[PDB]
Structure formats: C-alpha cells, structure tokens
RNA sequence: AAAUAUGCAAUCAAUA
RNA sequence: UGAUUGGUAUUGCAUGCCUGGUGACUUA
C-alpha cells in the first residue's frame, strides 16, 4: 500500500514531455555525506490510544520539525509509514520510533531502506 | 469533466506583479486626484457652512473620495475586497497557499 | 543546631544546583553524531584530545542518580504536607443517563467537531 | 575567521573603554545631571569606540553594537 | 568609463537618492533630462519629492515627444507656472 | 465561563472594529517583502555570474577604486600576497525605517547594499504541496 | 563499595550496569547515524572514531557489473543463483476491466526463464 | 529579594504604582469613550 | 586612540591624486577589453511576467 | 435593623 | 503620496488553478 498507487483510467492523463533522470552523486565523503537523501518504511505493533490519534500527532510534529516527507498511518494496535528525507533526519526518526514513543510498542520493524536518491 | 486532453501544470502568475488593468490605473488616478484635492473640498465645505447654504460641489463628482473603489491588488477585480487583505478571493487563496502568511499569524488550521 | 538548620537548606540548594548543572546536558556529552566524528580537531593533544573515555561520564551519572532519588524525599514531604492540609476532622435498579440515553451518531458535518466530521458531507 | 577575530577584538576594546572611562551613577543619571566631566567622559568613550570599530569583509552592515556584530 | 561615484550626504557611505534623482540607477534618460532641465532652471532637484520628480519627468517627456502644446493643465495652469513654483520651493544651492 | 482562554480572541474577532481592536495589519510589510524576494531571486545569481566572469581583474579593479576613493588602497591589500574575497551583494530596495533600537539588524547599514547568499537549505516561502511560487519557471509550457 | 541488590541482579541478568547498557545504546545510536557507520579503536588512553564504512541496506546484494545494490525478493528461493538465469518476454498485453465509473486497464505478461 | 525570580522592589511601592496605573487607565477609558465618534467633527445642531 | 585631528581628505593634493587614479583606471580599461566589459557590465531587473512572455 | 431602595448576555482581577 | 508593455472579443468541447453533485477511503 502507498499513497502513490493509482489504476490506469480510460481518459488520457498528461505525460511528461521528455525523460531525463538526474544522475546519482557517488563522490561523497565526510564533507558531503550529509547532503544525501534517503527513504525507508516502518511498521510498529503494540497498543495505542484514541485509535492512534496521539501517535499521529506526535509523528506529524516530529516530521514537521525534521522536514521529512512521506506518509504515516496509525490505528489502535498498529502503525505503518513510508518516510523520506535527509539521512540524519531519517536516523533521528528511527531513533524516535524505537525509543521515544509514548505508547506500548511491542515490536518495531524497518524495511526497504535506500540511500543516495536524487 | 475528465478532460480528454489534459495540458501541462502551469506555474501560477507572480503575486506582486499583476497584469495590466486600465481600470486599476484609473482607480489609482482617482485616488491621487482625491489626495491632491482633499483640502479644496474642505475649503468648499467650510465656506458653505459659514454662509449657511447647502450647495453642491460638482468637482467632487470627479475628484472625490467616493470615486475610489477597493479593487483586488493581485487580480484587479472590484468586488469582494476587504481592507485587511486588499485582495479578492483568488488573490487571497494564492497568497495563503504559497506560504506568505505563515509569518503574519495566519492559522490555516482554524475554521472559525 | 540553630546554625546547622539555618544552613541546611542553603547547602541543599547548592547540591540541587549541582544536579541541575549535570542534568542540563545530554548523557554522552560532548559526544555527537556530527562535527564530533566528521571534523576532529599529535602536536595538538594538549589542547584537544581526539581520544575519549566514557567511564568518567558513567560514574558522574551513577553518582547523580542516588542524589535525585534522595531529592524525591522533598516531593514526598510536600505531598505529605499537602495531604495533611486538607484533613477534615472527626467522622460524621436501572442506569441513569444525561444528555441522551446514548450519544448520537453523526453522518453530517458537526459545527463543533469539524476536526472529526470534516470528511463527512455538509448536507 | 578574520571577521570573527575583529569582532572579538572590538568587544574587548569596548570592555576596556568601559573600564577606563566609567560613568558614575549610571548613564541615565549622568545624562540627567548634565555634568561637564560626565559629558566629556561619555563623549570620549563614544568617539574612541567609533574610531576603533572595524570594517569587516563579509558584512556590509557596520553594526555599532558588539553583540550584533 | 562608468558612472560617477555618489556623494554621501553626511555620516553615510552611499546614497541611492542622488543616483535616482540623476537617473543613473535605475538608468532612465527621461529622468536624466528632467534632472538636467531642473538644474539649468535653478531648482534643487535633490530637495524635491519623488512625486514632484516623476511629475516633472512625465511633463517634460510629453512636451518633448508630442509638442509644445502639451502637457495641458486645467484652470489655465501652465508648465511655466509649475516650474516657477518648484524653483521658489526648492532654490538651487 | 467554562472555556475562557479558548474564547479569548472572540471579542476582538466578532464585536470590535478593526480600527479600535489594536490588531496590527500585514499588508504594508508583505507588499515590500514579496517584491524583495522576487528582486533578489532574479538579480543575485546574475550578479554572482557577472562577478565571476572575468575573475582575474577583480583585485586590480578593487585596488584602482580604492586608490580613487580612499587614496591608500592598503586596507584590503597590505602586501602583494594578501587575497581579498568579494562577497556578492545587491541594492536594498525595501524602505525600512531607521530606529533607535540598538539591536536592529538594518539600522546601522550605511552602504545601501546587503550581502547575498545563494545557499539556503530551508525554503522561505514554503508553498502547500506541489504548488510552486509564481514567477519561478519562465520556460514556456509544452502541450501534448 | 558493595553494589546494591538491584544493581547486582541487573548485572547477573544482563552482564552490564544499567548505565553501561544505556550509554552503549546511546553510543551505538550516535555512531550509526546518517549513511555510514563509524568504527572504534580502543587502547589504554581511551576510545576514538577514526574510520567509517558505508552502511549496507538490509536484504540487498551488490552486483559487480551493475555496480549497485539490488533487493532480495521474497518467494524466490535464496539458494538459486539469479546470476546464471536468463529471461525472455514472450508477450505483454493490455487487459481491461469494467467498474462503476468506467473501464480500468491493467497489464498481463508471459515470461520464460531458464 | 530573598526569593529567587521575584521582583526585588517594595510591595507597597508596587501597590502605589498599580493603583496609579489603574486610575490613569480608568481616566483614559472615560476620556476616549466620551470623545469617540463615528462621524468625527460633527456637533449636533451645527450646520451639517 | 583618536582619529586625524586635521584629515587631509579635503585637500587639493588628495583631489589631484584621486584624478590621477581615475586617469589610471580609465587607461587600464582602455588597454584591456575584457576588463572594460567586466567593469561596465550592467544588469536591469524586469518583471517575471515579462520574462515569461 | 437610622443597612439597600434591588432585573439578566455574548472581553477583560495576569488588574475592576 | 514609488502606475503601467492593449482587448470584460470567441473558444470552459484545449487547459492550469479553484468549486458543485454522487461515490468511495477497512489491516492487521
């Protein structure tokens, strides 16, 4: 599941006039490794109150502070999300989800991690 | 409508650079004329009140405060304009959605 | 003694200030996930040592913990005083519902709870 | 780095001027009293600070406040 | 070549007002002509307001590019009367 | 009076004239701020390109202009092996008022110029979602 | 100084002091931040962080010829070596379905692998 | 003074200052309310 | 310390030196054509709508 | 009772 | 007290932005 999932309809949708893929910058050192982008997906299982409204607000606040993008989805017993942003921001979000959540978090899982995105 | 041949997503026009609007230009002309002739109208009214006569002042028809209308600054439309914004519905919407009002206390999360 | 009791709370305040100074910084101070590892500052070992030991900060926190645990006695005393200050003295079927038998379900935009009924139709 | 060093030098110079030509009784009280010695000392200190204020390379705003600089 | 450096009025390192009045920055030949004409007449242009400067610039441009019949003012007012008033208000030093 | 601070603003919002409520507007400031933003975004990069075009006679021109203006030209070039870096700058266009506030950042300015920086990680006029600030893409559109 | 009973029990059941465990976790978080992981060298004087290594995304394998990482897909048998299999696309077609709003298009493909 | 974060000035001084402030506020409100007008400059029975 | 008791920035010698520096700058600009452009370059600001159109 | 001569909102005691 | 690069002419069956009506939005 993802917010960017769509089914092809019967009417034309404007396509990009051309195709150009920006290159991946592989010459990154300690002086430039902080400018790289990244993405990951997270799943949390446990117990949350108000059908996950509290966790939703907390995650939205953290993402607004960290300038992260993507989407989240919290419910009574689970939470899922797809997060994208700077590497340091992603690491901070991972630490927050692992240790700084004010609800019962029985299990945490991270998957589909990618770095160096243009 | 489900457009059969959708076009490209166009970049919106500049906020601070409206297109030519002769109506807005004439409104500015009227504003400046009133600013220049405001004292003379006061003199007219002083003279008439001293003489105790309720006479008309025809030149005010052309150089008066009431020839001025609140026109949208970014759109040029002359209706639905508030002093607190000086802009019409669409001008206000574009300004708010571009993020120019966050500094000035605008709270998009408030309905009432 | 009189002077001992006079100075007891001032010295306790000094101790509390020390605890506050220690706690006002991150646990692994000055370690950091940035300049600390990416921009180290040999001939300069006298003014800046790249080497670092964690036992010092660990011992500092170990000594700090019991002091705050003891300072919790201040909270216990304050709670005791607060409870005592409200002492009174010698000792002297079907459901009931208000504002509907049950809460009403809304399928239209509620003027009050718009933040929860926004997705619903306005008519 | 040179601009920061100049700012620190300017702050040090301002502190030295403050200690060298202190205004007895407070600036407001000195101004209200309007004594010749107080006015002379304040003017001397102000002119010395103005003369010693540097001209940085990376900023085009010559801030007279060492805090701001 | 290049524009002449501005003269700071007092306690300053630059002055955009002088450049604007002389029409050097932003460059505007009509404003340069207005400045030259007012200087020749004997009006201290630097002491004038933006409104008066723009009005004189527009009047001069219209007169030059449409004829001596223009500009035309109501109530039997004349460009010569305007120039005399400006000269009286801002004597040239 | 069950919710006082929740309704705190209601009185001013509903039953007070704007001219007597004390609420301070924003039009007369944002009007200049938007034009400042556009002017800077349009002129800064071109100024930097013009500065870096030659990149060899910059110091010579600075030396000659210092001779013309100050007559010494040793403030920036004490000796032949000293390098004077040029920071791009643009004219200040928004008529801010000089104030006695000693902490004002744009009251001690005397040159009529401000340093310009091409780098800003945080975009200031953050739009909502995909929207782009108007006047950002000048390339003509292409239709299918 | 005799350790407290709680500290002794925690050491017995974990082998480290509560502070030791907390600081180990914090140090691990601080070191394994961003896109790289730092390595620690310990001596008499203390610890230091002088080298870093790129972090390897989970469940991905680096392909030499591509020079990039490729994900590991579930359902596939990991014993099978995908570098010695090849594929051919026999046919791809644009199938159609009907819903309330109209017609929905998806695609079908037939592929041979050996 | 003795307690940290509290104003060091005299409580009676503060009381006198507050009473003066309240009195001047009442006077300002009275004057403003009396002098307020929707059509400023208009006086009844004067040539309108 | 204080500044100049009698600054020489208002002296005929200073004015003559300024004129000489101006002449030197003009001569250098005439001699070098790249420097001439790099010195006389000007850039006007125009409307983004005008740019689009 | 030699006290009072009594109708209620949508702002303000962090100041009436 | 700092004005401007034509058209409120057709084409919303070319479009962008923005709206109305009807449908949906379920996971561990």
Automatic annotation (TrEMBL), chain A:
It comes from the Eukaryota. Residues 39-118 form the Acylphosphatase-like domain. Keywords: Coiled coil. This is Acylphosphatase-like domain-containing protein.
From TrEMBL, chain E:
It comes from the Eukaryota. This is Uncharacterized protein. It comes from Toxoplasma gondii. The chain holds residues 221 to 313 of 316 of the full protein.
TrEMBL record, chain F:
Residues 138-144 have a biased composition (Pro residues). This is Uncharacterized protein. Residues 122-144 are annotated as: Disordered. It comes from Toxoplasma gondii.
From TrEMBL, chain G:
It comes from the Eukaryota. This is Putative 30S ribosomal protein S5. The chain holds residues 799 to 912 of 1140 of the full protein.
């Amino acid at each position: 599941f993802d917010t960017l999932n769509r089914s092809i309809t019967g009417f034309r949708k404007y396509k990009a006039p051309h195709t150009t893929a920006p290159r991946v910058v592989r010459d990154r050192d300690e002086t430039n490794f902080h400018e790289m982008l990244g993405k990951f997906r997270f799943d949390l299982q446990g117990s949350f109150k108000e059908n996950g409204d509290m966790l939703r607000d907390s995650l939205l606040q953290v993402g607004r502070d960290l300038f992260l993008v993507g989407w989240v989805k919290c419910r009574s017993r689970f939470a899922t999300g797809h997060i994208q942003g700077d590497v340091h921001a992603l690491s901070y979000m991972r630490r927050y989800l692992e240790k700084h959540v004010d609800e019962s978090v029985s299990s945490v899982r991270f998957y589909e991690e990618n770095f160096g995105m243009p | 409508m489900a457009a059969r041949n959708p076009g490209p997503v166009l970049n919106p026009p500049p906020i601070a650079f409206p297109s030519f609007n002769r109506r807005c230009q004439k409104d500015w002309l009227a504003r400046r004329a009133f600013a220049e002739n405001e004292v003379n109208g006061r003199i007219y009214k002083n003279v008439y009140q001293n003489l105790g006569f309720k006479g008309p002042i025809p030149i005010l028809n052309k150089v008066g405060q009431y020839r001025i209308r609140m026109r949208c600054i970014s759109g040029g439309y002359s209706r639905g304009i508030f002093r607190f914004t000086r802009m019409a519905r669409m001008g206000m919407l574009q300004l708010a959605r571009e993020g120019w009002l966050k500094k000035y206390g605008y709270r998009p999360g408030l309905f009432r | 003694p009189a002077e001992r009791l006079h100075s007891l709370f001032a010295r306790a305040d000094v101790l509390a200030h020390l605890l506050h100074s220690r706690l006002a910084l991150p646990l692994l101070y000055p370690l950091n996930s940035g300049g600390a590892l990416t921009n180290p500052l040999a001939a300069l070992n006298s003014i800046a040592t790249s080497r670092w030991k964690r036992e010092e900060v660990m011992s500092a926190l170990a000594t700090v913990t019991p002091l705050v645990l003891a300072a919790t006695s201040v909270s216990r005393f304050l709670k005791t005083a607060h409870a005592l200050s409200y002492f009174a003295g010698p000792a002297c079927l079907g459901r009931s519902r208000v504002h509907f038998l049950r809460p009403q379900l809304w399928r239209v935009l509620k003027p009050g709870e718009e933040r929860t009924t926004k997705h619903l139709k306005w008519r | 780095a040179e601009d920061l060093h100049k700012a620190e030098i300017y702050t040090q110079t301002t502190e030295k001027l403050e200690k060298q030509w202190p205004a007895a009784g407070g600036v407001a009280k000195g101004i209200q009293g309007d004594q010749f010695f107080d006015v002379m000392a304040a003017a001397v200190r102000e002119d010395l600070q103005d003369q010693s204020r540097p001209v940085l390379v990376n900023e085009l705003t010559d801030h007279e406040n060492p805090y701001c600089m | 070549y290049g524009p002449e450096a501005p003269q700071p009025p007092a306690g300053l390192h630059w002055s955009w007002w002088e450049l604007y009045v002389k029409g050097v920055n932003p460059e505007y030949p009509p404003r340069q002509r207005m400045f030259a004409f007012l200087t020749a007449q004997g009006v201290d242009v630097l002491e004038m307001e933006i409104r008066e400067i723009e009005d004189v610039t527009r009047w001069l441009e219209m007169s030059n590019v449409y004829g001596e019949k223009f500009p035309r003012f109501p109530y039997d007012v004349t460009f010569q009367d305007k120039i005399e008033a400006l000269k009286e208000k801002y004597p040239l030093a | 009076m069950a919710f006082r601070y929740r309704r705190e603003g209601q009185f001013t919002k509903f039953r007070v004239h704007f001219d007597r409520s004390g609420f301070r507007p924003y039009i007369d400031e944002l009007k200049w701020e938007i034009m400042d933003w556009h002017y800077k975004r349009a002129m800064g990069p071109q100024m930097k390109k013009t500065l870096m075009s030659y990149q060899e006679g910059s110091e010579k021109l600075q030396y000659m202009h210092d001779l013309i203006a100050l007559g010494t030209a040793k403030a920036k070039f004490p000796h032949a092996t000293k390098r004077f870096f040029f920071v791009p700058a643009l004219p200040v266009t928004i008529p801010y008022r000089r104030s006695s506030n000693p902490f004002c950042l744009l009251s001690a300015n005397k040159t009529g110029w401000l340093q310009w920086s091409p780098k800003q990680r945080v975009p200031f006029p953050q739009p909502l979602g995909k929207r782009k600030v108007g006047g950002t893409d000048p390339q003509p559109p292409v239709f299918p | 100084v005799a350790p407290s009973a709680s500290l002794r029990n925690f050491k017995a059941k974990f082998g480290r002091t509560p502070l030791e465990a907390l600081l180990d976790s914090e140090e691990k978080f601080l070191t394994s931040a961003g896109p790289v992981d730092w390595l620690k060298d310990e001596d008499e004087n203390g610890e230091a962080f002088v080298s870093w290594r790129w972090k390897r995304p989970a469940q991905t394998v680096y392909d030499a010829e591509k020079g990039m990482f490729v994900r590991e897909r579930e359902g596939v048998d990991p014993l099978i070596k995908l570098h010695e299999l090849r594929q051919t696309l026999l046919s791809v077609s644009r199938m159609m379905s009907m819903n309330k709003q109209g017609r929905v298009y998806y695609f079908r493909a037939i592929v041979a692998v050996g | 003074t003795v307690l940290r974060g509290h104003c060091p000035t005299d409580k009676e001084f503060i009381r006198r200052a507050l009473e003066e402030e309240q009195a001047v506020e009442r006077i300002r409100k009275k004057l403003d309310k009396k002098q307020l007008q929707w059509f400023p400059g208009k006086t009844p029975w004067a040539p309108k | 310390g204080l500044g100049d008791r009698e600054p020489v920035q208002d002296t005929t010698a200073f004015r003559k030196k300024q004129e000489q520096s101006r002449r030197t700058l003009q001569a250098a600009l005439d001699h070098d054509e790249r420097l001439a452009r790099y010195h006389g370059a000007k850039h006007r600001f125009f409307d983004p709508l005008f740019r689009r159109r």
